[PDB]
Design a protein around this ligand. Sequence first.
Ligand SMILES: Nc1ncnc2c1ncn2[C@@H]1O[C@H](COP(=O)(O)OP(=O)(O)OP(=O)(O)O)[C@@H](O)[C@H]1O
Length: 423
Amino acid sequence: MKVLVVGNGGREHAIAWKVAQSPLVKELYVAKGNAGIWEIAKRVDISPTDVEKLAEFAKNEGVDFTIVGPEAPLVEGIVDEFEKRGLKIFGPNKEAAKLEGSKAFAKTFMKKYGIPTARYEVFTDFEKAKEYVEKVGAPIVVKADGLAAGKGAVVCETVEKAIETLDRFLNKKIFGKSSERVVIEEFLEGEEASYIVMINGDRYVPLPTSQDHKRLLDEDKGPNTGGMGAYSPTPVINEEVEKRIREEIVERVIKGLKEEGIYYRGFLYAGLMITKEGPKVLEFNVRLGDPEAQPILMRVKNDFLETLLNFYEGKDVHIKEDERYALDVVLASRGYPEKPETGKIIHGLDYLKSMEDVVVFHAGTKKEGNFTVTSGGRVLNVCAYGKTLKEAKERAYEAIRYVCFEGMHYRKDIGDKAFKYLS
Ligand SMILES: Nc1ncnc2c1ncn2[C@@H]1O[C@H](COP(=O)(O)OP(=O)(O)OP(=O)(O)O)[C@@H](O)[C@H]1O
């Protein structure tokens, strides 16, 4: 069968990599993808957000199954475009994608269905929002309503930073309609963690747990980014935390969707903050997280293509998790998360291909002749398996010693928050 993966980053390389292990796929396509994915998939020169054009391609090319990686295409209704042409695609339709597409929608939904989350208030008026934050004081979190390419959610340590943020969002409208409405919520403290499940109507199946590191620099400093590294599983989500997540979050989302009459099929990644009060939703992501997908998929033993195909049509499935830990360190471009420098030659990729228990997922890489060059903010995902987390971390960092590109930056503390939970 023909399978199409939509997206150009590390999450998509992980997806394609897993799909390519299945005896079912005969032709694998990626739109657009990157240098790393092109070693195992045919390049489709269509941007992931050109949803109508992608649907037309899949139809004409006869794609049997499509898996969507990033949020933009989903929020834009790529699934609806595919359904319109009678195509099978894994991901939520435009209405269901609102759980990620609109913070206001998500927060209102969670309040209505009793889902644990940060207390909040919604605003469309700068003066009103300003007066509000001055009254509540800091720390506080200010978020744009719609997608803002990783710049919509800002933690403000001071009231001044909050008003400055509101100014850019509401007065300047830096993100257009996306920033014309904002959500201001309480700053939550605790340990961050990621819980991802696959949902199809009333049924859901959990995927490996994980913990990401959002800040650019070691000891959680510097600006927020799309994610600088993640590992699986994370002890932050023990047996009982997982029980609370499934019952107070996942199952309540399912109940809410049912009451709203909204059909949901696809991945649901809940960005969490595990507080002393219990797990709370920072935000919903209607797709796999990046880089969370990398270590997660590294630990899914079974044929993931078969699993997705069966789950897609309502068949029961059972995820078999690798007993080994999986850790991923992101190598980013100088400038990231602000304008990244690009066009730098990446050396050492061949060395890593021969390293055992090492896996590299490309993110933002392209070709320049026979050379592989940087083309985006996040460039490489240097991953490694390990019987223990310590082993996984050390192997990943050992691998980093052999890869290189000008201006490369990466955190050295990926996974450090987990050790206080282990022995
Ligand atoms: N209520 C909160 N309390 C504490 N930290 C928060 C809160 N909300 C968000 N954060 C921090 O911001 C991060 C989210 O960054 P993220 O970019 O994923 O926001 P987003 O919802 O995806 O919208 P955008 O991508 O445009 O910024 C969280 O992982 C967390 O570290």
